[PDB]
Design a protein around this ligand. Structure first.
Ligand code: HEM
Length: 367
């Protein structure tokens, strides 16, 4: 789609596709993301029925409609503050991340799929630790995909089934079991907060799912990019701090996000009415030639590197510090342990929003 993006950036940067407005230019995307007053995230009615929720009124709905991701301040800020400290660099479980990474890599043969054997389990084990739940990896992965793989698919991520009910019941079981028992981990903090049961479930589910899906894509995308563009020696000698940022820019785990206008606005020469949906194409913004010279070139030491892969503004990814830490440790440990001979087989995830490999088989040599 990068060709489409390039074609759209030059001839129709602010484009209406018949249902929603699409932004392909970096500056337009950054502006929209930072301007939360005019471009709301209140896309699921969370802010509107907050009063109803806190009153004690119970109605059947899917928890995922009630998370900080789709809320405007002050509610948004109040929600984020509940767990924000736990995601600050100084509080991340650094040793645990490294320990799990090394053990996962110890179980590998000269040829393996880095997605199922490494990229998938690492984030799941780490977020489970922070949540304080005992990680049934396969189960958590299945639920994560159940929710994540519905993104882009019109109104399905809010549709419920047997597997979704299983997820909601698990969230309720975990939360209820920690209510009145502990507030040391994320589950306990949510459970003992003053939010409605439905909000607690959504908050818990958000942290568990957003906590691994995109990080798996980042690690897999980076292993692919570093191999293809021969960045491994650079990472072994300099570390992966800048390389991870280029991987984020070049292969964004999340291709786009969305907002809804709260008032009539004008972007470039286009007038957009109140209540209209606006797709912010992070992927296209990251390849905007204006902002990124040699946009299609993978330059691991690109500096500075202001990509929008984690968003921008008040919704800037709460897990950004954690994701970068996991990716940095995963890739540096991988580089130290293996010499990638070749990418044997690769298969992309079929989704419009999530960008990554569902299978990436590599042949390596010890050292
Ligand atoms: C690993 C690659 C990741 C990427 C590329 C990514 C990207 C993003 C983006 C773009 C947003 C904002 C979406 C919007 O503005 O509508 C967001 C929000 C959020 N992310 Fe991530 N994320 C990643 C990992 C994680 C992880 C690991 C966690 C938790 C472990 C996490 C927790 C959250 C939360 C809670 C929000 C909501 C923030 C709020 O609305 O203020 N993310 N992420």
């Amino acid at each position: 789609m990068y060709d489409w993006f390039k074609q759209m950036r030059k001839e129709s940067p602010v484009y209406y596709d018949g249902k929603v407005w699409n932004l392909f230019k970096y500056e337009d995307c950054k502006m929209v993301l930072n301007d939360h007053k005019r471009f709301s995230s209140n896309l699921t009615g969370y802010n509107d029925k907050l009063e109803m929720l806190r009153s004690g009124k119970v109605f059947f709905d899917i928890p995922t409609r009630y998370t900080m991701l789709t809320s405007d301040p002050p509610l948004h800020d109040e929600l984020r503050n509940l767990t924000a400290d736990a995601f600050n660099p100084s509080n991340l479980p650094v040793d645990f991340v490294r320990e799990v990474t090394v053990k996962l890599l110890s179980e590998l043969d000269e040829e393996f799929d880095v997605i199922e054997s490494f990229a998938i389990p690492l984030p799941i084990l780490v977020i489970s630790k922070m949540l304080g739940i005992n990680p049934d990896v396969k189960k958590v992965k299945d639920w994560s995909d159940l929710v994540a793989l519905r993104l882009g698919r019109a109104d399905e991520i809010f549709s419920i089934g047997r597997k979704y009910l299983e997820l909601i019941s698990f969230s309720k079981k975990e939360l209820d079991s920690r209510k009145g028992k502990e507030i040391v981990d994320l589950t306990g903090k949510i459970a003992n907060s003053n939010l409605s049961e439905l909000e607690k479930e959504g908050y818990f589910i958000l942290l568990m799912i957003a906590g691994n899906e995109t990080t798996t894509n980042l690690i897999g995308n980076a292993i692919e990019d570093f191999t293809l563009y021969n960045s491994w020696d650079y990472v072994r000698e300099k570390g992966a701090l800048k390389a991870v940022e280029e991987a984020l820019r070049f292969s964004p785990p999340v291709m786009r996000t969305i907002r809804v206008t709260k008032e009539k606005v004008k972007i470039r020469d286009q007038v957009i009415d109140e209540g209209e949906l606006v797709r912010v194409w992070i992927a296209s913004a990251n390849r905007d030639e204006e902002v990124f010279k040699d946009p299609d070139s993978f330059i691991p030491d690109r500096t500075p590197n202001p990509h929008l892969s984690f968003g921008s503004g008040i919704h800037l990814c709460l897990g950004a510090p954690l994701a970068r830490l996991e990716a940095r440790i995963a890739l540096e440990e991988f580089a130290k342990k293996f010499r990638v001979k070749e990418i044997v087989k690769k298969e992309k995830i079929d989704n419009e929003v999530l960008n990554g490999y569902r299978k990436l088989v590599v042949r390596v040599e010890r050292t």
